[PDB]
């Protein structure tokens, strides 16, 4: 069990990092176009 979870925890952390990176990019691109 603890293994399977640790596994999910890790998969979730990586997806979170990818999404924050994508969000930081869209905000910067949206700022750029706006002004």
């Amino acid at each position: 069990k603890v293994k399977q979870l640790k596994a999910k925890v890790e998969e979730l952390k990586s997806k979170l990092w990818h999404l924050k990176n994508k969000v930081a990019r869209l905000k910067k691109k949206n700022a750029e176009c706006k002004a």
Binding site: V2, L5, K8, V9, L12, L16, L19, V23, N30, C33
Partner: protein, 35 residues
Amino acid sequence: EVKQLEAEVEELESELWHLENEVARLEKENAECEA
């Protein structure tokens, strides 16, 4: 452990949900500004 990891999984999943909503919004803000 187990309880600790389920909480962790729960907390990562929530944060992802918010980011997924934000990504979806930002992408649309971007499509409009550029279209």
